[PDB]
Design a binder for this molecule. Structure first.
Ligand SMILES: [K+]
Ligand SMILES: [K+]
Ligand SMILES: [K+]
Ligand SMILES: [Mg+2]
Lengths: 266, 68, 153, 164
RNA sequence: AGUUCGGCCAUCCUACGGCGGAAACUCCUUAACUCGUUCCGAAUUAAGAAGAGAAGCGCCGUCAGGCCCCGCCAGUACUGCGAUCGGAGACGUCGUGGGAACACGGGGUGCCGAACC
RNA sequence: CCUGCUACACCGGACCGCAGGCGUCCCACGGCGGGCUCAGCGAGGACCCUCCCGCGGAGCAGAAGGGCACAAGCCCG
RNA sequence: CCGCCCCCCAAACUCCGAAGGGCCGCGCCGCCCCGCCCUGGCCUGGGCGGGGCGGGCGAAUGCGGGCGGCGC
């Protein structure tokens, strides 16, 4: 009665897309334009700085593409921060920035394990005070040991203005990595001037504290529903700046990773 | 059928004189315009796996969905 | 003929293979090339920049120039009584690394390997084209006897 | 019985087809949904129907949430709580259409009378997998909505009789 | 067992049924701030942590369609070299080399690599 | 000058051989970035709207052949 | 309209695909060091060269090879 669209011939003709394209986890146009490199360079490693978000976690990876696979050099997961002193609110702007800082410190300390006089952690020690201003490790221009260079890969997320992937890139930059970038798509840009306080606001997470204050002011019942874990951990909406400050102190002091043994069940 | 079995070759002989060159009249071993022989078609119809259709006979299929 | 545009006579050689349309896989750009290497030319019909003429499809040559985006390849081409050494500039989608000396490198390595491994006598290492076969024994305790059959028609 | 299978009103679409009558109808949908409406252009030229191409032919608006549900309740009450058995799509939606817009509520006819298409689209929790951008799949055929479940839910919620 | 990044691109696809969840991914809750919808927080952006194994996902199934391997089809079709072979011709034959496809039947239905739980 | 075929699977190969095209058109019908998905079939809705499936069956100035789907098509800056 | 069968086709139809052709290769290699300069986060590469020890003649058949000038 009705013609059948999926036939013998339809299936015989059908070409399947690459597995990771069918699963919707890769864009190969962007992947080509990221891993491309001039052919008179003869297998010199190129590096992506990959930022990925899930529900309940943030991942930052430094990666190089080989023939049959690709090496992750350093990794840093935002669920380690509870160890450094950030118990709740993970997956917000502050945690994205802090995880970027963690990955940067860990990479540079790792590649400066052993070197005595000129080591990429003593050279290029990052930025300390968490000021949220423009900064570029490539302006320093040491002429014998350059800064570590990577390019920001963000996959399928949107490059909106005020995005957590850019926050994490900023934290890596403050840790001391060369990551070429503009300040467009950061909070505090009017196209005729960029400011630093309106960026430190989101870095230190004042929006969350202001929202807790006003929500607790009008509706306490919904305060309890919205923020139950914040209440349970008793971190008041006013101590966040100190908590982030100390978190940064610990991250810079001990960026080394500790391998959590575990036992996985089928 | 068996009614015209004697006169088909007469009609084909009439036909042969209208075509250029040399042509051969033959009687096949198959059953009608079907693709089995008469004796194989016999046994096949006798055991029952032979599928019928409008004017042609096929075999049991044995492949695909079981019944539904 | 009466017409010889650049892509005359390309209806089949430049068409893409069945269920092999779309973007190239990325080994096309992760392969590493060197000066002096051997390559085959095969035109991929989806990539239009730096696409060699039809004469060069199915030939083997040597790299003379490594460039930022294209490779330089030397091809010997016969013209009307002599051979000419032609030089072309081809982008990566149209070249593959060639295996024309794979067998030779295998044999050289094996020759040195067996010389080191020597068993005290050194084996003959020259390739030997198939010889006539030696004398041997076959049992015939179970022969099958066949004959021409009769014409069946 | 399980949650995640509860039916819900995915969206309501109000649609109008037909100088400045569309301006006035846009005012009507404007004040009746509190959302700027949208216009749609004519694909072809049907001179029998009296339309060029570049003309603004239709207007429409899409409402969601408690707002969509309240407007659709009042639309059924215009329809006297009656619905055809055959009006439920094979895919789990339905709809209808009023003929005189002020049958929603007394409005000085100023802006003139129009008739509208209500179209209700239902869904379940978990239908995001077919509309999100990354890792977009198709919904399970069992998790999908049948017209039987659709009529059952609509009758149990709004208590509408079925003409046949 | 799982997640992120990949290689080769269906033995991995499509359709319909079933079975799972400790950890993980997912569905999921909100619209102060950020940003955004030819209209719409559907999408996307920001902020969560009450609720799920109903979906996606993992796995099992089906005289399943597709896809892949083997045998047969068949030394058949076709064809390189040689012939003062046959025949009015159209075409065929012999000698010496190469050798298919369709159809048909039995089998099968992703593995490799880097990092973390 | 150009496409497909003649042409007998590298290249080349004749005829007043076969079926045809060119002397133009576009500051956007161009460059780049982002987002999106087309032709339709089926089922619904007062006298264009919605869902679902959708290997391209559309489109890409003009001949023919080839090419292209988070694009080479459409929309916005 | 839809589904199963079915006779017969294409120089400008092809999911398959010969015989037949075509292009390239068949001797120098390994291991260690040292010198020079566009490229890389670097103690990276890549190219061009020097040294030092292990070796070595690696299908068949036939046979000397290459370059120019002037001219019909
Ligand atoms: K005759
Ligand atoms: K030539
Ligand atoms: K599930
Ligand atoms: Mg992009």
């Amino acid at each position: 009665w009705v013609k059948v669209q999926k036939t013998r011939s339809y299936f015989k003709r059908f070409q399947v897309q690459f597995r990771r394209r069918r699963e919707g986890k890769t864009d190969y146009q962007a992947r080509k334009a990221l891993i491309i490199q001039d052919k008179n360079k003869y297998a010199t490693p190129r590096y992506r700085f990959v930022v990925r978000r899930t529900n309940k976690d943030i991942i930052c990876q430094v990666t190089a593409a080989e023939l049959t696979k690709d090496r992750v050099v350093c990794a840093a997961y935002s669920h380690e921060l509870p160890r450094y002193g950030i118990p709740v609110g993970l997956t917000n702007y502050a945690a994205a920035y802090a995880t970027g800082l963690l990955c940067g410190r860990r990479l540079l300390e790792k590649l400066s394990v052993g070197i005595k006089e000129n080591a990429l952690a003593q050279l290029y020690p990052g930025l300390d005070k968490a000021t949220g201003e423009e900064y570029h490790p490539d302006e320093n221009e040491n002429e014998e040991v350059h800064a570590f260079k990577a390019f920001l890969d963000i996959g399928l997320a949107r490059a909106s203005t005020g995005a957590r992937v850019f926050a994490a890139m900023k934290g890596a930059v403050d840790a001391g990595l060369n990551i070429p970038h503009s300040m467009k798509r950061f909070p505090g840009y009017s196209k005729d001037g960029f400011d630093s306080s309106a960026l430190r606001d989101r870095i230190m997470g004042k929006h969350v504290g202001d929202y807790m204050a006003e929500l607790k002011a009008e509706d306490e019942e919904t305060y309890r529903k919205r923020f139950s874990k914040y209440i349970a951990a008793k971190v008041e909406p006013l101590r966040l700046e100190a908590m982030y400050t100390k978190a940064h102190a610990a991250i810079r002091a001990n960026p080394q990773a500790v391998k959590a043994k575990f036992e996985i069940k089928k | 059928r068996a009614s015209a079995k004697d006169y088909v070759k007469d009609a084909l002989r009439r036909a042969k004189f209208k075509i250029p060159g040399r042509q051969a009249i033959v009687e096949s071993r198959n059953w009608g315009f079907t693709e089995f022989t008469k004796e194989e078609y016999e046994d096949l119809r006798e055991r029952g796996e032979l599928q019928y259709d409008g004017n042609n006979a096929h075999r049991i299929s044995r492949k695909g969905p079981l019944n539904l | 003929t009466h017409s010889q545009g650049y892509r005359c006579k390309t209806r089949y050689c430049f068409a893409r293979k069945f269920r092999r349309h779309g973007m190239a896989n990325l080994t096309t750009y992760n392969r590493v090339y060197k000066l002096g290497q051997y390559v085959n030319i095969k035109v991929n019909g989806a990539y239009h920049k730096g696409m060699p003429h039809r004469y060069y499809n199915g030939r083997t040559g040597t790299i003379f120039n490594i460039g930022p985006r294209a490779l330089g390849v030397q091809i010997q081409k016969r013209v009307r009584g002599r051979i000419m050494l032609k030089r072309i500039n081809v982008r990566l989608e149209h070249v593959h690394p060639s295996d024309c000396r794979k067998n030779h490198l295998e044999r050289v390595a094996a020759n040195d390997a067996a010389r080191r491994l020597a068993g005290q006598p050194v084996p003959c290492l020259k390739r030997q084209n198939a010889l006539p076969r030696a004398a041997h024994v076959v049992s015939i305790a179970s022969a099958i006897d066949i004959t021409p059959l009769k014409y069946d028609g | 019985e399980n949650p995640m299978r509860r039916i819900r009103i995915e969206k309501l679409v109000l649609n109008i087809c037909i100088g400045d009558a569309l301006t006035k109808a846009a005012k009507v949908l404007q004040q009746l949904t509190d959302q700027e409406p949208t216009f749609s252009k004519s694909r072809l030229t049907i001179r029998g129907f009296g339309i060029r191409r570049g003309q603004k032919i239709s207007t429409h608006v899409t409402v969601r949430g408690e707002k969509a549900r309240e407007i659709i309740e009042r639309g059924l009450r215009v329809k006297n709580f009656e619905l055809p058995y055959s009006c439920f799509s094979t895919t789990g939606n339905f709809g209808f259409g009023i003929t005189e817009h002020i049958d929603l509520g007394i409005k000085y006819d100023s802006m003139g009378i129009y008739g509208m298409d209500f179209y209700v689209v239902l869904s379940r929790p978990g239908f995001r997998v077919n509309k999100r951008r990354a890792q977009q799949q198709h919904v399970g055929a069992s998790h999908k909505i049948t017209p039987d479940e659709a009529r059952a839910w609509v009758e149990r919620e709004f208590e509408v009789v079925y003409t046949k």
